[PDB]
Amino acid sequence: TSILDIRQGPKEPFRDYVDRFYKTLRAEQASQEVKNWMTETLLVQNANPDCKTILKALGPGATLEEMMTACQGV
Amino acid sequence: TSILDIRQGPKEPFRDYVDRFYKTLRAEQASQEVKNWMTETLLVQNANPDCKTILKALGPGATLEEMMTACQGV
Amino acid sequence: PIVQNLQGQMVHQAISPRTLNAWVKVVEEKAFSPEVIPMFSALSEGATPQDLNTMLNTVGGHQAAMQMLKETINEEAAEWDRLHPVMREPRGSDIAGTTSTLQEQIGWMTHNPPIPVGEIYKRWIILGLNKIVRMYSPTSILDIRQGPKEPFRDYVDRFYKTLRAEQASQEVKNWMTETLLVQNANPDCKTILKALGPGATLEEMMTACQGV
Amino acid sequence: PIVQNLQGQMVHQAISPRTLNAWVKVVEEKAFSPEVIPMFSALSEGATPQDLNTMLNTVGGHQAAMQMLKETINEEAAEWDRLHPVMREPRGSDIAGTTSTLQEQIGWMTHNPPIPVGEIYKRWIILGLNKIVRMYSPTSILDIRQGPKEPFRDYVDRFYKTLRAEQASQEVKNWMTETLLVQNANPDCKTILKALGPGATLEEMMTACQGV
Amino acid sequence: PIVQNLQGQMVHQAISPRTLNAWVKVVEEKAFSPEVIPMFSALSEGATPQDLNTMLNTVGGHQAAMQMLKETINEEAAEWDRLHPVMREPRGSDIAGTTSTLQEQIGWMTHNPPIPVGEIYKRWIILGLNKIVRMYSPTSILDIRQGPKEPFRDYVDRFYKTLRAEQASQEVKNWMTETLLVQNANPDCKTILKALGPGATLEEMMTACQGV
Amino acid sequence: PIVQNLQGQMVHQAISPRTLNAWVKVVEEKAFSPEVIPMFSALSEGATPQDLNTMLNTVGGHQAAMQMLKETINEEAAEWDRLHPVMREPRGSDIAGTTSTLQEQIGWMTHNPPIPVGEIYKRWIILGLNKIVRMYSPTSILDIRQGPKEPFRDYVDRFYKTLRAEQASQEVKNWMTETLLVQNANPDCKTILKALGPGATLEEMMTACQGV
Amino acid sequence: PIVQNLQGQMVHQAISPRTLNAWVKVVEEKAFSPEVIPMFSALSEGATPQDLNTMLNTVGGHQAAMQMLKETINEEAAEWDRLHPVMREPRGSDIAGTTSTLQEQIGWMTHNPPIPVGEIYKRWIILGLNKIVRMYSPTSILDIRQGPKEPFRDYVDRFYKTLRAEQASQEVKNWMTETLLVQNANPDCKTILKALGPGATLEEMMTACQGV
Amino acid sequence: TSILDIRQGPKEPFRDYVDRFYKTLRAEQASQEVKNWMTETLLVQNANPDCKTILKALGPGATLEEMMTACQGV
Amino acid sequence: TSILDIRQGPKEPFRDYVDRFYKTLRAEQASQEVKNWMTETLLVQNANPDCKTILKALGPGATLEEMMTACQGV
Amino acid sequence: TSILDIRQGPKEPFRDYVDRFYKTLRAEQASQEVKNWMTETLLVQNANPDCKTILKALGPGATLEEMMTACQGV
Amino acid sequence: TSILDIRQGPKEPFRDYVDRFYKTLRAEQASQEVKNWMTETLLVQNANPDCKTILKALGPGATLEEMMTACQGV
Amino acid sequence: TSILDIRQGPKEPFRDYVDRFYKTLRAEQASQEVKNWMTETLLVQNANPDCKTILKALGPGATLEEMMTACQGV
Amino acid sequence: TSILDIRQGPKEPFRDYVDRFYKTLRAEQASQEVKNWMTETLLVQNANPDCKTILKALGPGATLEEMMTACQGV
Amino acid sequence: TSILDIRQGPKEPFRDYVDRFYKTLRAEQASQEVKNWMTETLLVQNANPDCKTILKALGPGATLEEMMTACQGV
Amino acid sequence: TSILDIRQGPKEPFRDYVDRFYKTLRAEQASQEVKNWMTETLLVQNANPDCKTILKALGPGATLEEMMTACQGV
């Protein structure tokens, strides 16, 4: 699995998806600005729709803390 | 249509509603203090229930760029 | 307040216990509806900054309201020092009455011409109370709509009450009373309010809508 | 108001903070029902034009009411100058207390005979408050009808309250109390009110309709 | 009212603005229920005829009530001149305070022994207010009946309130409280009120009917 | 009340018109609920017997209440003469202020040590008002039961209000608050009030029953 | 309170009869809701311990409340003697005003610098009133939940009112307003209050929830 | 019957009711101030709905002669 | 028709009956006291019952003005 | 009919109602201050719902010429 | 049974109820001021509806001899 | 009939029974203390039950006036 | 089409009728007072009934601005 | 779960609820004044209806040892 | 029966069980600390469940008075 094809399932809790995403990101180990892009754009774009709407409600530039505490009810 | 009648439909994209709103706001050509008030309060109040909560979460300081960026995912 | 002594000197008279209890009834029972600003302005009327602090100690029970007052008073004291760079000089915290003595406050209020540090601080307080009154508004003006069988007098009262709570400058208020007040009327009144045309004063609107 | 100093000179005493708060409660809580005119006339009782302006600053929150007062005061000041063409002379804006000093107002109020610039300006204000009370009337007198099970005392109270808000001269009021009050009664009372004949006083009407 | 000056002379102090506003609240808000007589008698307490006229100017808004006062005052002034045929003499219209100067009123009130023209005129006014309170009664005493589940305390309150509005002399009042109060009770209370027998005081009636 | 004159002599100041109107509002509007005793005791606070008679003249409209006051005052004046057999001597009817001059009352109140004829007569009046408050109680304490969904704070308020109207000595009151207050609670509260055991203070009872 | 005599000496003026009646209305009619502390603090404002005892004699009708005051006053008087071991010395029961003369109280309040035995005893009383206000709370803060159609302004008012009755220190209050106020909101408001994030001030919470 | 129980029947002539009223009033023999009050107010209040309006139209000053003269036509 | 046999019909308005009555009275032209008796007694006695009750509610001695304004609703 | 009973029918022309109103106003012959009040307020209040709104839109200053001119089209 | 639970049955003789009441009052052995209050008020309030009215008619001053003498006929 | 066997019927008004009782007592003309006993005890004991309860509600020693006014509703 | 026969249809918005009217008036180019008459009288008389009533509610002499803003809801 | 969501089930042992409560209280790691408040008030308020009454009967001073000792029998 | 096998029945009132318990304890006459243990532990443990819960609601160390007054409603 590339980081590009890690995706959140319908039932999958956001914290499980985030852990899969960042483990894949850590292994795939692209350069820092590619990691910035992936953690800002792919992390949201590959979230499931119910998380993706809650994430975009935060506006870009939020921390991972704020993203996880936001999605924790989904 | 008066600007007070420009209301976002339940499935209408926020960008299409903003386009209608600011077109009507330009046609009505109320003075700038009134336009400022309308862009700050009325644009939010007339958004549909999906977008309206996103816009409130940005706070009154939101800029039209931020408002559209956030609502683009609805 | 300030009174003349029998020796002719200006001297402090403490704000009376029932004037303070009247202000307590205003702060407690009115929940910062807009009446709380005229009633403050009235009960404060002669007040020195020491007396005004004695009044604000009542708002100190509403810790959320009290910090907005503290903020706006600190803000205006700083801006005062900013516009007025340095019989001592009336500095911002001296006008607030934290720094100044009572004799300094009365002195400022009784030089010729006086420096009205009471009325100044009272104006900073009223600007803070305006923020609090705005926060405690139950509705925005866009939520105020006339009922299907509600008198136009009641709807006008609700409208102007809400309009008076809100931040709107006079130009925005004028636009609201000209256009929201018509738009948000019930259809029976809205017909007449349109038929008068846009140049109608509130008197003409009300006397036309009377009993509808 | 005016008081005697210990030196025997007439001098200003400021209108008390709780008298102002009483007037604020009148302006705010009564929504310009006709009670607001007797209560103004009472709380104003000793007032100089400076004090009357301090009271009108309370109405300044009701910008629609306040401009009717400004209008009627400017109108009466102009008409005063028109009837009274020119120890200085009391001009219209001097009676309003925009132009005059406090010492000028008290002087006029304490010459022999005095010029009662307080009671004059107070009368122009009461004429403006009459306009405002009329605008805020919930109903016209023709809308006041008795309920099918409403006491005639309640209906008389509603009627005379509305009659007291309206512009009617005393001749028109007399016709209304003689004929509308009968016409708009419920049929049970209307029978008795007719059977008394047209020359019945309100006392005779009420004591006949008592408990119906 | 009358006060002692620092020079020792008796002198007029004008009836205070909030005492007048208290009287306005009595006249306006209580609709001439019987409370309006004790409250008049209280707020009037020190009043000269000039002050009493300043109070009656409040009733002048209720033109039907005001003419009953004018009538009863003219009637009693005439009867005063009739019983008292002629440091000037206190004539009826002088006691009314239309004819007399303020200094004449205070003089009469401060001769030794005084002529209490204030308390006299105040008594004629209270006799007029009694007529008005009677006219505004919502019910006659014969209409006052206890509800099927109404406390005897509430019914006694309603009864004595109505009894206090009515024209009944004390002998007629005594008969009413002895017999109507029993007759018009609900059957549960009426049983006990009969079982006490006719010589029962109101205390004995109430404590027996308590909680029924 | 009594005040110091500028000449240093103690002198009468008449009980103020709005203090009398405050007492009228207490007598009229509260229907002798137990609040009427603290409010009497407060408004009376400085009163001479002349002033206390001026207050009782307000109760004179409630002829049933007024005769209980007359009775209790005559009773206590007689018992005063009985305990105190005979700068004149303060006799019972002199303390009542029917017999004594105003100067005699103030003299007694300002000898060294004083005879507090005001506070004495005020205590006889309060004993009469206690009888009247007891008569006007809507319920006996045995009738006070908690509703099935009534807060224990409301029930405690109703209970202690009724307990405060009744004749119970402090020992009987203590037994009532210990046992009736539990017995008459609803079953939800009654369970907890029993589980605390009999030695529970009202604070412990209320904080346990809070929100039940 | 304390006033300056015409001879320049500080002297007692008794707490006015209508200030006492205002305090009676606070104790009687408000049932120890938290307003009773600001209103005490206001009406007390100039009070000597003799005056404060005259105010507490009003609470003496609420024997359960009065013993909590007695307790807290005795407790603080003992702790005062404990921190302050022994122009006489102000001992605890002297500050309570059981032991001290009136002249001793005014002396302490007018030495240079003064010992503010009035404001001290007033602070012990306010600590007792806080205990009583807490006992009479109708609900704990955990019981305060928003209704399904209740304005967030009303719910905030209920919440902060209850929060103000409770014993919570400011750190616990801060946690409550940050987290209970969100948790106990209805789901419509709770969504927005969560979407603002945890760092939201009450102003930001209210203006976002306005009209929901 | 007390005087308060003496009430005019719906078809009873006013003269027969007055005869019952003043007979009962003589039997009860209340003092003259109370009798005056009863003859003035209670005699009117206890009349039937037909006569009661006639009596009110005469005003409180009506004399028993005038009251009976007026009600004779009912 | 004698004045004695002029009578108001069931549907006849009072003013029409009064005009018939006074025209007959004017023609029959009895002496003044007989006219007084007829205008006070026959005028009421020959009114229809609904007018006759309203007339007797006025009490004798009323003017013809007051009699007509009273009956005008019948 | 009193002037207070003169009310415009739902299909009645405003000119026919004005003719009835001013005929009744002339018959009642109330004093001129009362007539002025009736012509200003009561003529408007008694108009039918179609005309009444037209008359209110002219304001209280309307003259009978203007009132009739405006209502001629109903 | 507490004394507050001792209540007279609808057909129970007043003497049998008094026997139960004063037996329970002796067992509870509350202090004499409380006993006095209970004998004066509670004994009356707990009587059945037939006897309770008899006891109230004697007034608060009734003595147990008088109370029993009166209720013996129920 | 002896005074001992004079008794009130079920429908008999108390005043009729009292008149029969005291006429029999007057004729039978026992000594004064026997009359006292009969007028206090037999008069109540031979009343019908509805009167007898109302009489005992008065307590012994009442006058005949009070006994008759009490029973007058039965 | 003469200006005399330009007429508003049932569904036709007032602004479309006004534009047809004034284009025809501009082409037909009668003298100024005839144009005044046509723009005041024919413009209203040839409006459809729902507009014609709203126009006459304005009273004669209104501007074309006020006429168009008035009819814009029809 | 927040500590405010930790509520005792109707059949859940008080020791198992306390274990959940103090585990969540340790995880949330609010400052000690807030923990003190939660252990004193919230632990009681969130108990089930059986245990809650037991805990209230111990008073606010109860210690967790005493609270558990008492509720062990539920 | 040993004190160990004295037990409260389902219907048995607590005072009857306590009397059986303490009579058995008095006869079996174990040493004082064994009696302390039995009166604290066995007395509660052998109570019926409805009493046992009410007893444990008191917390250990209560007097026998408080235990009996507590269970008296069961």
Residue numbers in the entry:
A (entry chain B), B (entry chain C), H (entry chain C), I (entry chain B), J (entry chain C), K (entry chain C), ...: 148 to 221
C (entry chain A), D (entry chain A), E (entry chain A), F (entry chain A), G (entry chain A): 1 to 86, 96 to 221
The authors write:
To investigate what effect the hexamer–pentamer switch and the tilt switch have on host–protein binding, we next repeated our structural analysis on cores incubated with FG repeat containing peptides Nup153(1407-1429), CPSF6(276-290), and Sec24C(228-242). We determined structures of hexamers from peptide-bound cores to nominal resolutions of 2.6 Å, 3.1 Å, and 3.1 Å and associated pentamers to 3.1 Å, 3.5 Å, and 3.2 Å, respectively. In contrast, we do not detect any density corresponding to peptides bound to pentamers, though in all three cases, peptide density is visible in the binding pocket of the hexamers immediately adjacent to the pentamers. From these observations, we conclude that the hexamer–pentamer switch described above prevents binding of the FG motif in these peptides to the pentamer. Superposition of our peptide-bound hexamer CANTD structures and our pentamer CANTD structure confirms that residue M66 in the pentamer would clash with the binding position of phenylalanine within the pocket. The first switch alters the FG repeat binding pocket between the hexamer and pentamer, precluding FG repeat binding to the pentamer completely. Our structures in the presence of host peptides show that this change prevents binding of FG repeat peptides from Nup153, CPSF6, and Sec24C to this pocket in the pentamer.
